[PDB]
Amino acid sequence: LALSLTADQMVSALLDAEPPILYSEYDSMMGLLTNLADRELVHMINWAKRVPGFVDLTSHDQVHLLECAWLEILMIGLVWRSMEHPGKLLFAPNLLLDRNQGKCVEGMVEIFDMLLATSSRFRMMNLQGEEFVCLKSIILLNSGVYTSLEEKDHIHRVLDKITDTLIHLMAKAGLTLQQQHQRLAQLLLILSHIRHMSNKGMEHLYSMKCKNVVPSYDLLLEMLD
Amino acid sequence: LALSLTADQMVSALLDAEPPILYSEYDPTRPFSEASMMGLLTNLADRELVHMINWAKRVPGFVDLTSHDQVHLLECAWLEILMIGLVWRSMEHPGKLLFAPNLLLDRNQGKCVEGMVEIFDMLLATSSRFRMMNLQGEEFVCLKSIILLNSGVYTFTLKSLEEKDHIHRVLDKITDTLIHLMAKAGLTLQQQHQRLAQLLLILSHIRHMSNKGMEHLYSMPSYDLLLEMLD
Ligand SMILES: C[C@@H]1Cc2c([nH]c3ccccc23)[C@@H](c2c(F)cc(OCCN3CC(CF)C3)cc2F)N1CC(C)(C)F
Ligand SMILES: CC1=C(c2cccc(O)c2)[C@H](c2ccc(I)cc2)Oc2ccc(O)cc21
């Protein structure tokens, strides 16, 4: 049924599944970042269930995709909220942090710097929230797909649908065929830098280890049920 | 002159710039041990690196960048570039990685190195996806150049933005080139968009593999080295 969606219905569904903007619990820096990230994880589960073609997959497959993508998804949301705040990361509306505040934690300013650069690449492209929910979904289905045959064909048909959607959004905003091609690529090439940031960030979270730091296969299996 | 080239001119330059296929050092002791296989793979990798630099300098637009920027693109890209060459070579050996004509290894021969099978599996999976997609050599060389220009660009002043913008325009010329390759093949406009997307999404996984790959190596090239080789 998700394969039957028009471009507009795809965006309407993705825009209507958006998670809400959470606030940072205080009224220690690793503490606020960690607690916030745990709380957005809960909302990300119910976001992912609403991504079209996601619940068409077995729960095993659903959780492998979330396991591979959760940090990328957390990060692309951070970068989106941060577009209109050059030089700062809008973790929460009461947690806007600058490059200098990354230095309070050994290891973080490197990820902080990569997130800022992605945020200004979205600013200098004037990334639209319709395109952004598209990329966020692309990340969900794409980042673990390559690890049975009916499942990865269906995922690749839904990913072909979101490509159609990105092209449609670009045609309706007036861009020529050529500008449509180029913008799609520039948007998708940024996903590979987002992958790099997730990997480096994952890497920091194990040196960071206060133990049981990262969402395990079984924890994620419970939250979707 | 890079930004005036026609699609077919870009395909041409890229195809001639391809580095040769090399051979692994000849009759090592087999069966391998962990130290001897890592020794071969390393020595083969190092020898490919020299040819990669000559390759890099012939990628339209690369030599327009400052020495320092060229090195940084390479420091960030070189393992993805090594790994996509392997996947390409190994497309016609299902279940095998053709590291060299004389070094064709299956999954089980990757267990000889602790931590390596996990990497092996990823590389083989990618090679199977390129098979499933019927990846073309003309597309291959466009994606490789895309890797070289893109991976290091989000890490790069008036001059620094000119550097950034020029690279982004060359990437835009490589996109048009892939699209021309697809249009000329007879694919529809929708099919063109979808295949361009599927290919570019594959570069996200190639980035994952290079990162895990870099992790694996540490668990077991300098700026100065790449810069000397570049001049
Ligand atoms: C700055 C980035 C990204 C980031 C962190 N915060 C966020 C909150 C909202 C949006 C983005 C973020 C933070 C971060 C995080 F993303 C996760 C985390 O730990 C989660 C622990 N939970 C146990 C649950 C399993 F059940 C997972 C701790 C963090 F500081 N940071 C990760 C690093 C640099 C280390 F890559
Ligand atoms: C992908 C890859 C290696 C690889 C890398 C990491 C993990 C792994 O399992 C294999 C390994 C390698 C070994 C040492 C270095 I220095 C670099 C690459 O040997 C290679 C040789 C040639 C080539 O084109 C690719 C590889």
Curated annotation (Swiss-Prot), chain B:
Post-translational modification: Phosphorylated by cyclin A/CDK2 and CK1. Phosphorylation probably enhances transcriptional activity. Self-association induces phosphorylation. Phosphorylated by LMTK3 in vitro. Glycosylated; contains N-acetylglucosamine, probably O-linked.
Domain NR LBD stretches: 6-231
Tissue specificity as recorded in UniProt: Widely expressed. Not expressed in the pituitary gland.
Residues bearing the modification Phosphotyrosine: Y223
Lipid attachment, kind S-palmitoyl cysteine: C142
Interaction with AKAP13 as annotated region, ranges: 1-231
Phenotype when changing Y223A: Reduces PELP1-mediated activation of transcriptional activity
Recorded consequence of changing I81C: Loss of transmembrane localization, no effect on peripheral membrane localization. Impairs activation of estrogen-induced activation of NOS3 and production of nitric oxide. No effect on binding to ERES
Further remark: Selective estrogen receptor modulators (SERMs), such as tamoxifen, raloxifene, toremifene, lasofoxifene, clomifene, femarelle and ormeloxifene, have tissue selective agonistic and antagonistic effects on the estrogen receptor (ER). They interfere with the ER association with coactivators or corepressors, mainly involving the AF-2 domain.
Domains (record comment): Composed of three domains: a modulating N-terminal domain, a DNA-binding domain and a C-terminal ligand-binding domain. The modulating domain, also known as A/B or AF-1 domain has a ligand-independent transactivation function. The C-terminus contains a ligand-dependent transactivation domain, also known as E/F or AF-2 domain which overlaps with the ligand binding domain. AF-1 and AF-2 activate transcription independently and synergistically and act in a promoter- and cell-specific manner. AF-1 seems to provide the major transactivation function in differentiated cells.
Protein name in UniProt: Estrogen receptor
Gene (name only): ESR1
